[PDB]
Specification:
alpha+beta; Glycosyltransferase; Endo-1,4-beta-glucanase f, domain 2; Endo-1,4-beta-glucanase f, domain 3; four-stranded antiparallel beta sheet; 23 strands; about 35% helix; globular; hydrolase, sugar binding protein; Cellobiohydrolase; Processive
Length: about 625
């Protein structure tokens, strides 16, 4: 009804209007309407578990503002149907929780891959498997695979069929210096139909022999977001007296949360702080860091001979979700069906909040995270390394090209979740954390006299937090610096959103931070005045990095020779574009070429699905909290 609710409805309609092309013919949201884009997915009509979780969240807000929950239901329907691997996609058997996987190291550059399996390295015990099978009577892992080829652009299809839409693929497999430009896109379902003699397997892992197999990789931040979204769909549906029709879907979130516990464990279930790849594996929860790590992954032979599961040793603050954790731990409607599910999430909630606080810089921004596997090989931490429950501080977990915490976006995305958690519970630690972070946000966000604005785009870091001992020290030697500014509309909105939940919480529990509200509303207003266009909102952005289309060599081993489904040859010396020749048919290919040849950065007005969702949600959030 209100102005900001009206704003949500307007953008929601732009998003769902088929003329604008946000979804494919099966109703799967693309990463973006535009196809020529490269940043995490390397093609715009791929999609991510991230996009799906935002789709669910968008429709949850629709339901609050509308009373109509069909939107939210069909979003979850599409999610489960397409993005979660079905029983035939992940036909797991012969799993050994006492030998969950076999170790391989991580390496500094892509040219050091394939990484050899090291069979003497002890791997710990998986304490979740038996519990989940007992609870659900199934070996199906209920989590989203992170990357999908929506309209079969790459040509691998569904389960090696080479034709079907909604094709599971993966890219990143070769360490922290493998940028989005340096991957070899390959099917999750490996039958040796494409690539080289052993498919794409021997680009990534070196083994004595190779088997046809499947494997998937979860993005825990996306799954948690879907759960967070469902929590609000739940409270909002119960408020309206329509819990029951959405109660099937709250159970989906609870089950997803139950399996999302795999993200809480070390990659190879090694004890926290072990610092030795030859150290004995964990017995149970001694290998749990209780945080949302970069991934969990699972795979198996096509014939069911063997299977494996891994957590991740790398944790980024940007992935954490105290709202989702609190909901799973404490909300009886959201309670996971397993005996220990809720209890583990209660531990995770507490550990997560400590983690945020430990990482809070002198200024207020949150630093990157930590690892239980130094250099991805369980190596000895350098002298003077700051630690968190035995895990070593890392300014940029997992990726260094570019650094994973040089993106300001994680500040907004992650602290937005903390803000919701604070608004809900009034947790003092969360409040204190937010208070300092919001103070920082105010000192750096730019409100220009002309009506424009800019938020931090790139960050840089120096120093370390103090070693964690259960109390925030102030971390006087840990420093953030804002390198440059931009007008990223998705993040701008997420930031405004976070500010509104904090501000609302302060009204409820402490002294009303009206300044946080005013700054947020300003951002949403200035952006609404400037950046509306025919498919939603967009701000011009240059992509000087797109010279890597033409200039980035993809590492392929000497003598390794293979093919992509369209016929592109994969060999030593190939460029990014050489194994993706269908890009030359893209409507925007002329524009890219023009810019590249004239030595200038190509400019785009993108409509990223998640960005448009964040925008809608942030405006609707003002209405919900202050309307």
């Amino acid at each position: 009804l209100g102005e900001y609710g009206q704003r949500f409805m307007w953008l929601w309609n732009k998003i769902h209007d088929p003329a604008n092309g946000y979804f494919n013919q099966d109703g799967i949201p693309y990463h973006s309407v535009e196809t020529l884009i490269c940043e995490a997915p390397d093609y715009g009509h791929l999609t991510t578990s991230e996009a799906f979780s935002y789709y669910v969240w968008l429709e949850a807000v629709y339901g609050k503002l509308t009373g109509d929950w069909s939107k939210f239901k069909t979003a979850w329907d599409t999610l489960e149907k397409y993005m979660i691997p079905s029983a035939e996609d992940q036909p797991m058997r012969s799993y050994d929780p006492n030998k969950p996987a076999t170790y391989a190291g991580e390496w500094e550059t892509p040219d050091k891959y394939p990484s050899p399996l090291e069979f003497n390295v002890p791997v710990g015990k998986d304490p979740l498997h038996n519990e989940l099978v007992s609870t659900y009577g199934s070996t199906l892992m209920y989590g989203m695979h992170w990357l999908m080829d929506v309209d079969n652009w790459y040509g691998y299809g569904k389960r090696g069929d080479g034709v079907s839409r909604a094709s599971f693929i993966n890219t990143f497999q070769r360490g922290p210096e493998e940028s989005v430009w340096e991957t070899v896109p390959h099917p999750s379902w490996e039958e040796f139909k494409w690539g080289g003699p052993n498919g794409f397997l021997d680009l990534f892992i070196k083994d004595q022999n190779y088997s046809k197999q499947w494997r998937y990789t979860d993005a825990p931040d996306a799954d948690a977001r879907a759960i967070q979204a469902t929590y609000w769909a739940k409270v909002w549906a119960k408020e309206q007296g329509k819990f029951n029709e959405i109660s099937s879907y709250v159970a989906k979130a609870a089950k997803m949360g139950d399996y999302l516990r795999y993200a809480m464990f070390d990659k190879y279930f090694k004890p926290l702080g072990c610092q030795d790849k030859n150290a004995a594996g964990g017995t149970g929860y001694d290998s749990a860091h209780y945080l949302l790590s970069w991934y969990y992954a699972w795979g198996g032979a096509l014939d069911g001979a063997w299977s494996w599961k891994i957590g991740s040793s790398h944790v980024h603050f940007g992935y954490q979700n105290p709202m989702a954790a609190w909901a799973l731990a404490n909300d009886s409607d959201m309670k996971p069906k397993s005996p220990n599910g809720a209890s583990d999430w209660a531990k995770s909630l507490k550990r997560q909040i400590e983690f945020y606080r430990w990482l809070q810089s002198a200024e207020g921004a949150i630093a990157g995270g930590a690892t239980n596997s130094w250099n991805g090989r369980y190596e000895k931490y350098p002298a003077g390394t700051a630690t968190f429950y035995g895990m070593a501080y890392e300014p940029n977990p997992v990726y260094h090209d570019p650094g994973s915490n040089t993106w300001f976006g994680f500040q907004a995305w992650s602290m937005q979740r903390v803000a919701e958690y604070y608004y809900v519970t009034g947790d003092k630690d969360a409040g204190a954390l937010l208070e300092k972070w919001v103070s920082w946000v105010k000192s750096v966000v730019k409100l220009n006299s002309d009506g424009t604005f800019a938020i931090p785009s790139t960050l840089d870091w120096s120093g370390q937090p103090d070693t964690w001992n259960g109390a925030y020290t102030g971390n006087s030697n840990l420093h953030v610096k804002v390198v440059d500014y931009g007008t990223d509309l998705g993040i701008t909105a997420s930031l405004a959103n976070a500010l509104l939940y904090y501000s609302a919480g302060t009204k409820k529990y402490g002294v009303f931070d009206e300044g946080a509200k005013n700054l947020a509303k300003e951002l949403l207003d200035r952006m609404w005045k400037l950046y509306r266009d025919e498919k939603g909102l967009s701000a011009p952005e240059k992509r000087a990095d797109y010279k890597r289309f033409f200039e980035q060599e993809v590492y392929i081993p000497a003598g390794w020779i293979g093919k992509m489904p369209n016929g592109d040859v994969i060999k030593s010396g190939v460029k990014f574009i050489d194994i993706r020749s269908k890009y030359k048919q893209d409507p925007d290919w002329p524009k890219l070429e023009a810019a590249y040849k004239s030595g200038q950065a190509p400019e785009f007005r993108y409509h990223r699905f998640w960005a448009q969702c964040d925008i809608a949600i942030a405006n609707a959030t003002y209405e919900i909290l202050f309307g």
